Design a protein around this ligand. Structure first.
Ligand SMILES: Nc1ncnc2c1ncn2[C@@H]1O[C@H](CSCC[C@H](N)C(=O)O)[C@@H](O)[C@H]1O
Lengths: 265, 265
């Protein structure tokens, strides 16, 4: 009778909310997609074991083109769940699927889960200070995406931090590292020369949020661009002007150069 | 020797993650704070029964002034949990507590949970389009703060959405309603005349996010200002120019008038 969109969280199968788990366990059919993000600390098997249900994984094509043919038909006479990494409606286009559900006469409900969008709070940067977000996409052929550079410029001008989601090519098992994102940004900088992203720019890297020991590092691009931040997923952040407490946390917790403690007010 | 910052999530006792629950259950001591926000869909008793541990609630003073006197001494020789509504470290004052832990020679780990910051994705508005966030504070005496109005102005002129956290008197457990926020914003507009918030402004109200039955409503201030959005908590969003997909979700899912499809896109 219903369709549930349930987030699985940041890193492993235990990042699902108790609410989401109890609801999933009682659903008749369970579908899921693992192309919008990477849960580096679990496997399909462990997720299936926790929920006690077989999980039918769908590809991007299955979802975007055939969601109404694969999932919705069952939701008309059964309780169906659609699982996704992190929060199902953050930096995905899954919200549109609720419209398809409605038009198909299917009621849908959303169960949230920890998202990287809010988890960056662990970097010590004030969440309210984050401005517009952007995605660093892999260049393809003659096409080299650069909109994310303008976003950083716009936020920085306002003293706001910029969250940069990094690209993912699930089927090819490609996960953009913070290092690759920094390299692309330097290239865009040489092209636009806006002084937005250089070797002297302070950046923050958060890798495998959700795990108990995520990698949290802050420093200048010149020093971090070749640093090993561990396995993906990674997210890159370009902070705006720092408040004293933000700088203190980056130094004490993220190993940033003590010199950033001296904010230029 | 270990302190766990564990998020309780959005609304009720089941919004904690499985990871958070299992870790909390094994902790020797469990503390909690309910001053950064509240858990409107549950009670201390229900949270205690779920975790199966006595929970010592701490006031803002207990934490800000005495975190190292009350919590850290126990964390030095035991496993201690510190529960917070939402996702830990979204609240600005949380981060610094990890530095206190470090100074006391205590290891700390963060267990994330859903935050309203990311849960607003259920409004159908693209997460990347949210700019700087702000809090609408109740005016009192001769004090009439209005910085949140400027935040909306700066975001909107850049085509970005503005997430407005509404004031809460945690201690007294009194919540500002979206209606009161709209009244205040109209009040501020009449004083600043910036043309930022008027009867013709399109707003989105999200009430009781996390619940299976949150109220999601979109429409013009003139129509929503006296509407009943149900019990707290309420969140108010002033969207910037909309992508057609965002507008269609607001119409189909949030009952927005068809007019937004031609006026706000
Ligand atoms: N645990 C994690 N650690 C670091 N980055 C993460 C992450 N989970 C997701 N990301 C980042 O976000 C991108 C996916 S965007 C989809 C996000 C998801 N709906 C959520 O709510 O988190 C990844 O390519 C990566 O850059």
């Amino acid at each position: 009778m219903v369709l549930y969109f349930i987030g699985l969280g940041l890193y492993d199968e235990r990042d699902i909310t108790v609410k989401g788990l109890e609801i999933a366990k009682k659903c008749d059919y369970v579908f899921a997609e693992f192309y919008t993000s990477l849960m580096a600390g679990t496997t399909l098997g462990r997720i299936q074991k926790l929920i006690g249900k077989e999980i039918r994984v769908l590809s991007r094509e299955d979802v975007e083109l055939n969601f109404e043919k694969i999932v919705l038909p069952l939701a008309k006479e059964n309780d169906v769940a659609f699982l996704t990494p992190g929060d199902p409606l953050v930096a995905t286009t899954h919200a549109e699927l609720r419209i398809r559900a409605k038009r198909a006469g299917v009621e849908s409900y959303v169960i949230h889960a920890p998202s990287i969008y809010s988890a960056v709070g662990i970097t010590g940067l004030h969440i309210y200070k984050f401005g517009k977000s952007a995605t660093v996409a892999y260049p393809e052929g003659n096409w080299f995406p650069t909109s994310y550079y303008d976003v950083i410029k716009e936020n920085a001008e306002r003293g706001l931090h910029t969250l940069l989601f990094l690209d993912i090519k699930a089927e090819k098992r490609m996960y953009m590292t913070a290092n690759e994102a920094m390299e692309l940004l330097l290239k865009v900088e040489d092209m636009k020369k806006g002084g937005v992203f250089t070797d002297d720019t302070l950046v923050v890297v958060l890798a495998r949020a959700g795990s108990l020991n995520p990698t949290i590092r802050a420093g200048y691009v010149k020093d971090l661009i070749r640093e090993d931040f561990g396995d993906p997923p990674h997210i890159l952040i370009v902070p705006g002007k720092l408040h004293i407490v933000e700088a203190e946390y980056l130094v004490e917790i993220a190993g940033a150069p003590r010199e950033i403690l001296r904010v230029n007010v």
